[PDB]
DNA sequence: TCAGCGAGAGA
DNA sequence: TCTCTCGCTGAGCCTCTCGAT
RNA sequence: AUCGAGAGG
């Protein structure tokens, strides 16, 4: 049964590799128990005694002599070593790694609803992956007297099968799991809640956790079983324990994307919004302004608030002033626990000033405020995220002026480094590395030309005097904010591509002077190929 | 409260992987024993019982030894 | 119940004591007819009955007759999971050498012997084991110490 | 430029502003050619099949005064076409028969698979194509280590002769300087001893290569060589090279030589043809082009000596990866190739059955035996490397697969072995080679897209066409040109200005030179592009606006666009390429006119057009029928359909789309959907890349599509407990029996769920359709039972009106025992005996049409890279609605704009905006019936903006009913084409956008459907292009508590089919064990796998409420110990 | 082959000397009872 | 195929 | 004592479909 | 269960 002769639709059997070795090695031996017997001559007894030693050799280790034995078709056999060693042998694909029951595999979506130890999981893989405990409880409620009259109210679903299932997985833990497991945090358990669908529902904080995002990618749940595998994955497991990773200090669940858009768009001020100059009692009365519409939300305002610090030895105590904010910033105040400082909140909250504030809130008060005031900005970022109403338009890209100019040069000096390679007093390494020098020198003064104009180019008037404000342009506040985007990306939009490097190293050809905004000709093109086989072909094969 | 963290519950103890306390006997009695709860269920499922028991203080080690001890007297 | 794995070589002793059947001659698998034929590579007297208490000779079938040989064929009745256990030998005319020592690292027997590998591999060859058996077995090791 | 009644219908506005010379050619020519040359009938017998039997005949007969002659080979009439070999399940093959005569008779040399009209082989009722390869050319190459082969650094030379046919040969050096001959690739030997085995003496040798040896300018490495060689006379050399090819060694003089001439000097062991004679040539400078296949001394002393000047520093090192070097193996080359080997095979047959001597008996036929030839040719036709399984999702998924090369296959390279320079672009690929569409797993770099324009020389060098400048001005004539003539020229680029002289405008001119570009003057310029878009391939020029995108993007948008899954109702793209009509008509599922004429009758399956009485035949009725393909499942259980697109009474031109095939809509290819898009976050709903869906989108059904599975039941044959077809089931209810008929097969038509019975459980798991179509084969002389009966008397009933609605129809235009004939041997052919597999008692194949709708989970993408997943259904009323109260389709996340680099989403939704305002103010002067001048106006103002446009559409041509259909085939948005790098730029959408009252920045005020408050800022709103790709969550979720086990490590088998588990690999055993997670591991590695004993008793502790396991020892670790001790080492478990 | 001729011995010390043959491992709630098994020795 | 490492070769 | 040919070891994870033996 | 070919993450 070790080498089993699998039974097959057709007549014919189908044979595995050890036996026809088997079956040659015994083949060989009998024909020298009957040769010997006979007294053959002693050059002919001694040839296949070698043939012996290569079937011996063939059976166990094969290949190892050379000219592996082929079968029928043209692939080497597999011999007893090959059933040990390698990725296929029994070390690395049946003892340090095994398919498990209990277990299923599907899509995932955001489902932006769930608390921060909640999954979102299907009816139909629930009523399968806890069959077993709906059996159970189906016994012991008397609705049932056999295993088999169970089983078949849970084929035919009836209503009570729906309310088992709900009691029954009321607080068992569920594993969920990404494909590559890079880390630790790659594996978690989540509370699971059922839905209605077929796809599973992932909080939208653990993402970046998974490095999972929702592109189609997939997921695996397996289910714990006994007591102790219940409150290990309570204890150990759960997302709410894995605030911080285990590599670093730095939070793992740190708001982005929409969270943060929506955050420092709160946060932000401008310049003669309406109802600025106003005096307000508290965070209450910002939120009813901002809501009726009597008030815009980046106005300049006064509001009287009250800190709590914990200063104090063992205890906190509380200090009420008037303060200089803007009113969304009175009514993200509303959320805070108690015993921080206002400063968190008076200043534009990018992703680093969030991730610090949820650091500083796990350091001073502890794990369950973190939670809280974690899934609270969730929601608040998500909510006025959506109502900044804030979009992306090819009107919203701005070129410079300065742009053509410093290629001009710069093409000026590549010229000349080109005339001085033409005489004899340079070699060909050194001109490449001064032309690649000076393209990349161009590339940065361009980057920064761009970011300059697009940075400050805002102009409104308070009581009829000009005055310049930081922008409101969507790219722009897309850059400041760190929910995605870099400096490259902007650059690559409104100034020069820059220059492309192949999968084994640079590239100094020509330098790309047109945006994605206005676009490339053919050349360009053809010569910007190159960057994306080497980014792929590098993923793919290291 | 304590089914979202148990940070309460393992300050008691002190140690995280000290949770064999939580499972193997005390759950386990509740469950396949005749022992009853000491706080009021709510409807919770057991092994949340447990911890909320050891989050308050009446279940340690020292306290279900001692227990224990007192059943193995007839 | 158990605390330490131990690896060492095999005895052709403790090979000949793992086997439960006989031996193996006839180099058959199977198709005589649909039961397995005697003494192959999938047997019965060798490696057990093939179906669960049940013998392959008929006599008899039940759990209770359980620990009892057969007439027709000789073959033990028992659980059909035995297969996953028993084991057998097979009887070389010849003496062969185990390609692991001689090959695959320095070689094992090539420094029990002072001569190189090339020398060892072209006896084996015939460009035999029993030379290479006898010169193993004629060596002292506390005086060549 | 007057315009086809297909074309008249509905205009696609074009924005190129570059005049197009050279037509799309046909896309699939490069299967059609090659196939073609394999079965023609060549008088020269150069070409393949006659060329193989030319090259393998006469049969010489070993002395023995016999001989085996052959006059010619003809191709037999096929026994069934392409579509009864489809249902049937045979091969379409057509019989080879030749004639020879012995010093007469035909003899039958197997059935050669044939091409269909498409360019796609029927191998077993599947439809497969065949790849063609890049492989590196037959001839001498010279190369180098690049100095990594020692520490020393030096680069180290070689030479290397390949052969099409042969063995190889190499000559190379070592640090120490010494020349060094290799064959077959097997160990070194000193080069010097070759030269004694081709009758050289020693001063000979000297006197070849030496005239005197100094430190730069020549070498001694002869001289080395020499003094390094062990032998000195020929026999002993000879005697050394024989050891060296056979381990045994033998000395054996008077055989050596005849294994050294046979080796490399005899026709039927080595030949080096025709394209390596002349490569061979080519690297050696000689005049001539043509020799003798067979490898002659001089050549030798040659590419030694030109190895020796590389060394030296007189020549140059070759490129490898130069497409001047690699040629292009089609289907038909590579059939020739093994027909060859099989005539090989039975020719050495024929050779030892002459051996023996039969007089007046021997017959030409008895000798030859075809079945090694039907084996060779069914091996290549079903199990090669390149025979491939077709790719029928959607007609651009078919061009596509059918137009690769693949640099992988026999002779070709493995996946490992390549290295990262073949997997990068090369500056000759412009023109011959797509540089953006490719595989993005491992098999990048190593499989290509053939380019739009792309022609396969005679010898295999893709060649791409030019435009000849004469004196200054640019002319009409165009060149092909290879990628060895292209370097010596200048090549202009596509985007040069004219003067509608041909002379160029600019003073400086951008041009391309030996793979460099630059600026150059205008009398310098020897040759121009034909097109922009000459570059990219089909998918990547079906892109709009591709100029805008990252090559990262377009790569991905490439690869997304051939997994879009035909829709319901198929719908235009507002904004195209102008690519589309190419790729539907030449795609082979539209039904094209093949005379023109007027239609006749139209009907769901079947059309008749009256032929016009120019184009008839002489004795021709004068009548077309085509015939319709009506739900029938292709190959990824896809739906393919046809539906007519014509009425009765319509004039018909040559090449009118007479119906429309899936994905195609009016002759155009139409993959998607188009729909309202706004850019904008709503509630975190499409938070990373998800997609915010309204209702109305699955209200109206879409992107509803329909799939088809196939499925089978075979009555096997057993002694014991044989199978049956019969409705009795034991221990079944009355219902199911009830579905089922008399006979026990599902009645036809019938609605199925999920464990219903098909034959007499079978339908599986949650999918649920309707039964479409049933068919029934049984072994040849058992008698048809019950249902089988009526269902080939309804064919048979079926075959008579079939062929009886042409007979009628063709009499209509127009002793009778001509065509009756035919109608007893179709009659026959449902009536006789069916081919079955041995050991079967018969077969039944049911058909379930399944319609999916979009749901949570549904992968769903754009043209530019941008994909998501649908993430929640909302209601109408929370969409949110302009100031009209239209409410938007879908809602896309703004934020994957900045970072994945496609600004062409944004562009397209500002295009498409623009022409559903065109659209929108056409149908409101049309549903007021305004006058038809005003519609004139409108309609001819709108076409003739632009700045300076080459379409130059005229509508006073156009009569009252002809603006009347176009003005109502426009009413849902007019379209508008962008060529690939010569589209619409941004002043052109804002003057279109302005001309349809529309604001100009693209951006309009929205309202929150919720609580009715204007959003604060503008939002980004258009039209945007969408499509479904294949990935659908209705058949990815699975789930497993128990089933069955594999049987030496019995641990769940894998795969959703197989029912079973997750792999929980060591990486997660890794994170528990991190997480110090010790018992969830234990349970995960015992109770839940491997473990015999814990599997059940933990099964019953759950089921009796009990959560407590009581592991023991996997069975893998007793495999493991087993198979170790069966090994030879004792190894046990101490206590 | 080294181990074979040596005659070594495993005392399944580590991570994957446990999860191979299927035991507790030696950290995280198995190091408790590991300790007992080694104070009982 | 590229990239390293250990035992064996002479020089 | 030491610089060089020749051999053997290794080369990420998970999932889905088809055909052909 | 393998081999080959695709595809997704
Ligand atoms: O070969 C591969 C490819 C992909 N992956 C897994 O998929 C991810 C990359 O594939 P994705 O497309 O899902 O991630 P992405 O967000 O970076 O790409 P875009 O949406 O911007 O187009 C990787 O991060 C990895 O988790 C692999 O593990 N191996
Ligand atoms: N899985 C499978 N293997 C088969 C089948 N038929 C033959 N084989 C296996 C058994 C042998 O290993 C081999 C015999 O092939 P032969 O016909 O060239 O292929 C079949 O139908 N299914
Ligand atoms: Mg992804
Ligand atoms: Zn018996």
Same mark, same amino acid.
């Given at each position: ?5 699998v ?6 059997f189908?044979?595995?590799?050890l ?13 020298l ?12 007894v ?16 094969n ?44 899509v995932?979506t ?9 999954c ?6 629930? +009523? ?13 409620? %008397? ?5 088999? &009259? &169970? ?33 630790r ?7 699971p809640?059922?839905?209605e ?14 490095? =999972?995002?929702?592109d %189609? ?7 714990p079983?006994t007591?102790?595998?219940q ?7 759960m ?10 200090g730095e939070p ?16 932000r001020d ?14 209450? /009365?910002?939120?009813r302004?901002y ?13 009287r ?5 914990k ?6 105590? $509380? ?8 009113v ?41 405020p973190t939670?809280?005031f974690?899934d ?13 109403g ?22 000026a ?18 001109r490449?590395?001064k032309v690649? !020098? ?6 940065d003064?361009?980057s ?12 409104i008037?308070? !009581? ?15 850059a ?34 047109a ?13 910007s190929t190159?960057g ?8 793919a094969?290291? | ?24 006997? #005390?759950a ?19 092994t949340?019982? &447990? ?12 306290? +279900?030894?001692? #227990?224990?001890?007192?059943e193995?007297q007839? | ?40 590579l ?15 000779? %008929? ?7 359980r ?6 064929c ?17 009887? +070389? ?5 185990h390609?692991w ?15 190189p ?14 030379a290479i058996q ?8 506390e005086?060549?110490? | ?10 205009? #696609? ?10 037509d ?19 008088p020269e017998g150069?070409?393949?099949?006659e060329?193989?039997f ?24 096929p ?11 045979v091969?379409?093959?057509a ?18 698979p044939?091409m ?37 650094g030096?680069?180290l ?14 000559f190379e ?15 070194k ?22 005239? *005197? ?16 060689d ?7 050399a ?6 060296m090819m056979?381990?045994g ?8 030589e ?6 490399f000097?005899?026709? !039927? ?6 394209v ?18 067979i490898?002659?001394k ?7 000596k030109?190895?020796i000047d ?7 090192v !070759? ?17 020739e ?25 021997l017959?030409?036929?008895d000798?030859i035996?075809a ?32 137009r ?8 070709g390279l493995?996946?490992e ?8 672009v ?12 490719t595989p ?13 324009? $792309? ?22 004539e165009?060149?092909?040109?290879s ?12 985007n040069?200005?004219?003067?509608? /002289? ?9 041009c391309r ?8 003057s ?5 040759y ?22 990252? =090559?990262?993007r ?10 879009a899954?035909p829709?319901?109702?198929?719908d ?6 102008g690519?589309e ?10 039904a094209?006119?093949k ?5 006749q ?6 059309i ?23 739900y ?25 789309v ?20 706004? *850019?904008?976050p709503?509630?975190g709903?499409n ?20 799939h ?18 019969? $409705? ?9 029996l ?5 006979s ?8 199925v ?23 029934? *084969? ?6 048809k ?13 079926? @075959? ?10 063709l009499?209509a235009?127009?002793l009778?025992?001509?065509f ?22 018969k077969?039944?194949?049911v058909?379930?049409?399944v319609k999916r ?20 259904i ?12 239209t409410p ?16 062409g ?8 905006? =623009? ?5 929108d ?7 007021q019936?305004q006058?038809? $001048?005003?519609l ?5 103002? @709108? ?27 426009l009413?849902?948005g ?9 589209? &619409?730029?941004? =002043?052109?959408?804002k ?8 604001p100009?920045?693209?951006?309009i ?25 294949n ?13 069955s ?5 019995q ?9 079973? %588990? ?8 890794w994170?528990?064990? @991190? ?13 839940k ?20 396991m ?13 198979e170790?001790?069966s090994?030879?080492?004792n190894?046990?478990? /101490?206590? | ?16 000397e446990?999860?191979?043959?299927g035991?507790?491992?030696?950290a ?14």
């Open positions: 049964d070790l080498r089993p002769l039974p097959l639709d057709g007549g014919r189908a044979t595995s590799d036996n026809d070795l088997y079956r040659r090695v015994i083949n060989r031996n009998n024909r128990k009957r040769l010997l017997d006979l007294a053959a001559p002693d050059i002919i001694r040839n296949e005694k070698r043939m012996l030693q290569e079937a011996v050799d063939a059976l166990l280790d290949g190892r002599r050379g000219r592996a034995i082929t079968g029928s078709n043209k692939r080497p056999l597999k011999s007893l070593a090959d059933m040990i060693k390698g990725k296929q042998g029994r070390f690395r694909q049946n003892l340090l790694g095994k398919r498990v029951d209990y277990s299923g595999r599907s995932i955001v489902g932006p609803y769930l608390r921060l130890h909640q979102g999981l299907p009816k139909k893989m629930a +009523l399968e992956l806890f069959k077993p405990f709906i059996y159970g409880k189906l016994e012991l409620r %008397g609705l049932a007297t056999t295993i088999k &009259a &169970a089983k078949k109210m849970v084929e035919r679903e009836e209503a009570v099968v729906w309310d088992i299932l709900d009691e029954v997985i009321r607080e068992h833990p569920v594993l969920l799991n990404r494909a590559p497991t890079l880390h945090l790659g594996i978690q358990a989540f509370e809640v059922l839905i669908g077929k796809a599973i529902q992932l909080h939208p904080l653990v993402c970046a956790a998974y490095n =999972a995002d929702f %189609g990618d997939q997921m695996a749940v397996h289910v079983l007591l102790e595998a409150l290990e994955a309570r204890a150990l497991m997302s709410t324990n894995n605030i911080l990773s285990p590599a670093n793992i669940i740190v708001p982005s994307q929409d969270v943060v858009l929506g955050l420092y768009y709160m946060t401008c310049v003669n919004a309406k109802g600025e100059g106003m005096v307000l009692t508290g965070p209450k /009365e910002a939120e302004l809501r009726s519409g009597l008030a815009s939300l980046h106005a300049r305002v006064k509001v608030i009250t800190e709590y610090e200063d104090a030895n063992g205890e906190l105590v $509380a200090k009420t002033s008037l303060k200089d904010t803007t969304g910033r009175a009514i993200l105040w509303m959320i805070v626990p108690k015993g921080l400082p206002y400063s968190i909140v008076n200043q534009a909250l990018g992703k680093k000033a969030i991730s610090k504030m949820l650091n500083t809130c796990y350091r001073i008060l502890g794990l369950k939670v809280i974690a609270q900005i969730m929601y608040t970022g998500f909510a006025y995220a959506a109502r900044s804030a979009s992306v338009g090819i009107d919203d890209m701005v070129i410079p002026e300065k742009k053509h100019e410093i290629i001009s040069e710069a093409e000096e590549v010229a000349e480094i080109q005339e001085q390679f033409q005489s004899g007093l340079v070699t060909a390494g050194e490449y590395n690649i !020098d000076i393209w990349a020198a161009a590339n003064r361009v920064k030309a761009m970011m300059d104009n697009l940075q400050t180019e805002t102009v008037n308070r !009581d009829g005097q000009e005055e310049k404000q930081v922008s409101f342009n969507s790219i722009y506040m897309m400041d904010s760190g929910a995605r985007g870099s400096a490259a990306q902007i650059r690559q939009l409104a100034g020069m591509r820059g220059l492309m490097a192949k999968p084994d190293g640079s590239i100094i050809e020509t330098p790309i002077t945006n994605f905004r206005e676009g490339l000709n053919v050349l360009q093109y053809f010569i190159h994306a086989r080497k980014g792929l072909a590098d993923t094969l290291k | 409260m304590a089914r979202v963290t148990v940070q309460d519950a393992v300050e008691k103890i002190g140690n995280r992987f000290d949770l064999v306390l939580v499972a193997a006997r #005390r386990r009695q509740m469950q396949v024993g005749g022992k009853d709860p000491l706080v009021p269920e709510e409807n919770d499922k057991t949340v019982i &447990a911890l909320r028991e050891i989050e308050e203080g009446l279940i340690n080690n020292q306290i +279900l030894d001692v #227990r224990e001890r007192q193995q007839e | 119940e158990f605390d330490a794995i131990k690896i060492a070589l095999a005895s052709p002793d403790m090979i000949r004591s793992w086997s439960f059947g006989e031996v193996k001659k006839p180099e058959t698998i199977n198709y005589r007819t649909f039961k397995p034929e005697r003494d192959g999938f047997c019965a007297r060798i490696f057990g009955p093939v179906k669960d208490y049940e013998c392959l000779c %008929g006599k008899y079938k039940r759990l209770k007759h620990g009892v040989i057969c007439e027709k000789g073959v033990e009745v028992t659980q059909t999971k035995v297969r996953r256990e028993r084991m057998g030998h097979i009887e +070389l005319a010849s003496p062969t050498a390609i020592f001689l090959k695959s690292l320095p070689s094992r027997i090539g420094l029990l012997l002072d001569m590998l090339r020398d060892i591999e072209r006896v084996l060859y015939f460009e035999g084991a029993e006898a010169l193993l077995k004629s060596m002292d090791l005086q060549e110490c | 430029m007057v315009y086809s009644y297909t074309e008249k219908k509905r205009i #696609r506005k074009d924005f190129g502003k570059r005049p197009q010379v050279l799309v050619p046909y896309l699939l020519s490069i299967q059609l050619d090659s196939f073609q040359k394999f079965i023609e009938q060549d150069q070409y393949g099949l060329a193989a030319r090259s393998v005949f006469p049969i010489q007969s070993y002395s023995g005064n016999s001989e085996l002659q052959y006059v010619s080979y003809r191709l037999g009439e026994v069934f076409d392409v579509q009864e070999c489809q249902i049937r399940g091969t379409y093959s019989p080879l028969r030749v004639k020879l005569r012995l010093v007469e008779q035909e003899v039958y040399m197997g059935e050669i044939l269909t009209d498409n360019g796609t082989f029927v191998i077993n009722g599947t439809e497969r194509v065949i790849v063609s390869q890049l492989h590196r050319s037959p001839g001498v190459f010279f190369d180098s280590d690049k100095g990594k082969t020692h520490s020393s030096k680069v030379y070689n030479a290397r002769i390949i052969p099409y046919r042969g063995s190889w040969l190499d050096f070592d640090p120490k300087d010494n020349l060094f001959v290799r064959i077959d690739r097997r160990r030997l000193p080069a010097t001893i070759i030269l004694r085995a081709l009758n050289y003496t020693t001063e000979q040798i000297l006197d070849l290569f030496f005239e *005197f040896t100094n430190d730069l300018d020549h070498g001694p490495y002869i001289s080395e060589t020499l003094r390094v062990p032998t000195n006379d020929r026999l002993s000879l005697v050394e090279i024989y050891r056979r381990p060694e033998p000395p054996t003089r008077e055989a050596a005849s294994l050294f001439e046979n080796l000097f005899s026709e !039927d062991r080595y030949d080096l043809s025709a390596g004679r002349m490569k061979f040539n080519r690297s050696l400078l000689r005049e001539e082009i043509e020799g003798s296949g490898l002659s001089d050549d030798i002393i040659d590419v030694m030109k190895l590389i060394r030296n520093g007189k020549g140059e !070759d490129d490898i990866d130069h497409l001047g070097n690699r040629r292009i193996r089609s289907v038909g080359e590579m059939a190739n093994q027909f060859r080997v099989g005539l090989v095979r039975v020719e050495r047959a024929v050779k030892e059955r002459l051996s023996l001597g039969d007089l007046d008996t017959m030409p036929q000798m035996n079945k090694p030839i039907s084996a060779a040719v069914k091996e290549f036709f079903g199990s090669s490397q390149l025979s491939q399984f077709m790719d029928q999702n959607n007609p651009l998924s078919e061009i596509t697969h059918k690769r090369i693949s640099a992988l296959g026999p002779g493995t996946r072995r390549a290295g990262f320079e073949v997997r990068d090369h500056p000759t690929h412009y023109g011959r080679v797509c540089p953006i569409e993005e797993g491992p098999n990048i770099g190593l499989i290509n897209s053939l380019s739009v324009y $792309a022609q396969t020389n005679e010898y295999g060098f893709l060649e791409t066409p030019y435009r000849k400048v004469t004196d200054g001005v640019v002319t009409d165009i060149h092909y040109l990628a060895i003539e292209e370097g010596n020229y200048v090549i202009a680029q596509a040069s200005n004219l003067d509608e /002289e041909g002379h160029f405008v600019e003073d400086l001119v951008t030179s030996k793979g460099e570009s630059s600026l150059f205008r009398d310098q310029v020897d121009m592009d034909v097109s922009t878009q000459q570059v990219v391939s089909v998918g990547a020029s079906l892109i709009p606006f591709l100029e805008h995108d990252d =090559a990262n377009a790569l991905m948008g490439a690869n997304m666009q051939r997994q899954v829709t319901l109702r198929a235009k793209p507002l904004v195209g390429t690519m009509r190419a790729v539907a008509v030449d795609s082979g599922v539209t094209v006119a005379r023109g004429g007027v239609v009758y139209v009907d769901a399956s079947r008749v057009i009256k032929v016009n009485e120019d184009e008839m035949y002489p004795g021709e009725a004068g009548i077309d029928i085509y015939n319709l393909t009506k029938t499942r292709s190959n990824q259980n896809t739906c393919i359909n046809q539906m007519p697109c014509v009425s009765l009474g319509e004039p018909v031109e040559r090449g009118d007479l119906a429309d095939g899936p994905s195609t809509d009016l002759g155009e290819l139409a993959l998607g959907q188009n729909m309202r898009v706004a *850019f904008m709503w509630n709903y938070f990373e890349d998800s997609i915010l869906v309204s209702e109305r989108v699955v209200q109206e059904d879409r992107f509803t599509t329909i088809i599975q196939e499925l089978a039941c075979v009555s096997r044959d057993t002694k014991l407990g044989p199978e049956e077809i019969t $409705a009795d089931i034991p221990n079944v209810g009355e219902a199911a009830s579905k089922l008929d008399e026990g097969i599902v009645y036809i038509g019938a609605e769920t999920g464990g219903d019975i098909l034959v007499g459980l079978r339908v599986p798991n949650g999918v649920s359709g309707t039964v479409i179509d049933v068919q029934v *084969f049984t072994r040849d002389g058992v008698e039972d019950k249902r089988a009966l009526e269902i080939e008397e309804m064919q048979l009933k079926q @075959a008579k009106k079939d062929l009886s609605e042409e007979l009628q129809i009499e235009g127009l009778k025992h001509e009756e004939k035919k109608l007893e041997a179709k009659r026959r052919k449902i009536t006789q005996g069916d081919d079955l597999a041995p050991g079967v008692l077969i039944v194949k058909y379930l049409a709708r979009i749901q949570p989970g549904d992968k769903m993408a754009g043209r530019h890279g941008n994909k998501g997943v649908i993430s929640k909302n209601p109408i009323e929370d969409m949110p609605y302009d100031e009209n109260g938007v389709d879908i809602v896309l996340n703004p934020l994957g704009v900045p970072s994945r680099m496609n600004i989403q944004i562009l397209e939704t500002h295009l498409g905006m =623009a022409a559903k305002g065109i659209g103010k056409i149908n409101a002067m049309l549903k019936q006058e038809v $001048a005003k004139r106006e409108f309609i001819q103002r @709108a076409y003739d903006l632009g700045a300076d446009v080459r379409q130059k559409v005229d509508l006073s041509t156009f009569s009252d009913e002809e603006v009347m259909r176009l003005a109502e085939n009413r849902k007019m379209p508008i084409a962008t060529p690939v790098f010569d589209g &619409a730029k941004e =002043a052109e959408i003057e279109l956008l302005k001309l349809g009252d529309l100009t920045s693209g951006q005020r929205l309202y929150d459907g919720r609580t009715g408050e204007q959003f604060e800022r503008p939002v980004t709103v258009g039209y945007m292009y969408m499509l479904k790709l990935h659908l969550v209705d058949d990815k979720m699975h789930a497993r508590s128990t089933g086990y594999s049987l030496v490590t641990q769940p088998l894998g795969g959703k089919a197989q029912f079973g %588990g997750q792999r929980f690999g060591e990486m997660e055993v994170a528990l064990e @991190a997480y110090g997670a010790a018992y969830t591991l234990q349970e995960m590695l015992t109770v796998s491997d473990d015999v004993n814990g599997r059940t008793k933990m099964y019953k502790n759950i089921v009796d409420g009990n959560h407590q009581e592991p023991g020892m996997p069975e893998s670790f007793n495999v493991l110990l087993k170790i001790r090994l030879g080492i190894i046990e478990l /101490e206590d | 082959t080294e181990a074979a001729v040596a005659g070594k011995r495993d005392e399944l010390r580590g991570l994957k446990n999860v191979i043959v035991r507790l491992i030696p995280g709630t198995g190091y408790a009872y590991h300790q007992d098994r080694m104070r009982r020795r």
